Amino acid sequence: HHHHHYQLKIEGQAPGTCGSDKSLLVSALANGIGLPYECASGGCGVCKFELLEGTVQSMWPDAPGLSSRDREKGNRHLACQCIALSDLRIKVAVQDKYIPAIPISKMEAEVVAVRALTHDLLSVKLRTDVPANFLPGQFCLIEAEQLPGVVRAYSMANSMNPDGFWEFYIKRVPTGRFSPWLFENRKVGARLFLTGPMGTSFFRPGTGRKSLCIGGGAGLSYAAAIARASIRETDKPVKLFYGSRTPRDAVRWIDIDIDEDKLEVVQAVTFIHQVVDAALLETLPEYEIYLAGPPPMVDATVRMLLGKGVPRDQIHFDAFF
Ligand SMILES: Cc1cc2nc3c(=O)[nH]c(=O)nc-3n(C[C@H](O)[C@H](O)[C@H](O)COP(=O)(O)OP(=O)(O)OC[C@H]3O[C@@H](n4cnc5c(N)ncnc54)[C@H](O)[C@@H]3O)c2cc1C
Ligand code: FES
Ligand SMILES: [Cl-]
Ligand SMILES: [Cl-]
Ligand SMILES: [Cl-]
Ligand SMILES: [Cl-]
Ligand code: NI
DSSP: OOOOEEEEEETTSOOEEEETTSOHHHHHHHHTOOOOOSSSSSSSOTTEEEEEESOEEESOTTOTTSOHHHHHHSSEEEGGGEEESSOEEEEOOOOGGGSOSSOOEEEEEEEEEEEESSSSEEEEEEEESSOBOOOTTOEEEEEETTEEEEEEEEEBOSOOBTTOEEEEEEEOOTTOSSHHHHTSSOOTTOEEEEEEEEOSOOOOOSSOSEEEEEEEGGGHHHHHHHHHHHHHHTOSOEEEEEEESSTTSOOOSTTTTSOTTTOEEEEEEOOHHHHHHHHHTTOGGGEEEEEEESHHHHHHHHHHHHTTTOOGGGEEEEEOO
């Protein structure tokens, strides 16, 4: 239904516009403003900003993204958790690196293909009208009309293509809202809204370096997409690890669809981030490394890698908040 458009005055920057049913973050990114973000889901806190003038409705007040140091300030909010209720004056430190490489849009999608990788995991491929332009390792915020007020980040598994396909592996979380849906009450022909492409943890080409991919749990999508781009780039030895709790979170490679021969998997079946240190030892620093999965598994791998020589700028990751 209807949307209102308000003025988004952002200090030090050109007057943009925000919306009444769009996060402030996706409003700014639509304007091409490199407003800091990571999860876009209320966890990282990277999208924090102060309110100089105006009002906002928070999608989720309890959001642990902002430290109570920011919360004690009182006028600080998460850009990924706010909608504009009026004209707004905000102060955020913006950075070019966040500027979208490919212009983000909200688009209409139709479920075209479903595949059960495991009982825990399900691949859904959706068709948009427009081409599916996105960088390897990026994500979309995916909404569903029947479920109002629940947007959820999901990493692209497939690669950018002219015929407008978007594929996601989603893991079933009982106790969740969105996951017990595609896993229960949805099928081919179901209608979904895709907001993207989002993410700054995408594949970097032309570094002239080895490429290591480590994906935990549902972080297979991100890890696959990177690895399946790494071999397209050079076909030099490209490494991909997978993390699962039980050896029965079925591991398949034709189901995950690469050069089976030119990609050596080291699926770890429990914590992954120890075998990676085991096999590669001190080879790490010469790799560009890419990381995805639940926050505890991801937030732990970053220090084991950082403490073992690897420069900060050589590591890339999306934590599944
Ligand atoms: C960058 C990124 C990429 C991701 N990629 C993938 C992927 O490829 N595959 C995959 O399976 N999962 C991915 N996730 C996690 C994905 O959101 C899961 O589906 C998550 O478990 C949500 O499922 P749910 O809504 O059923 O669970 P819920 O338990 O309903 O929601 C859990 C998450 O939703 C958010 N949340 C909590 N409360 C609220 C609220 N009141 N309003 C709005 N949001 C709330 C929080 O981020 C929380 O961690 C990703 C997350 C991020 C941040
Ligand atoms: S980007 Fe808003 S908290 Fe992660
Ligand atoms: Cl201002
Ligand atoms: Cl949004
Ligand atoms: Cl907030
Ligand atoms: Cl948009
Ligand atoms: Ni109205």
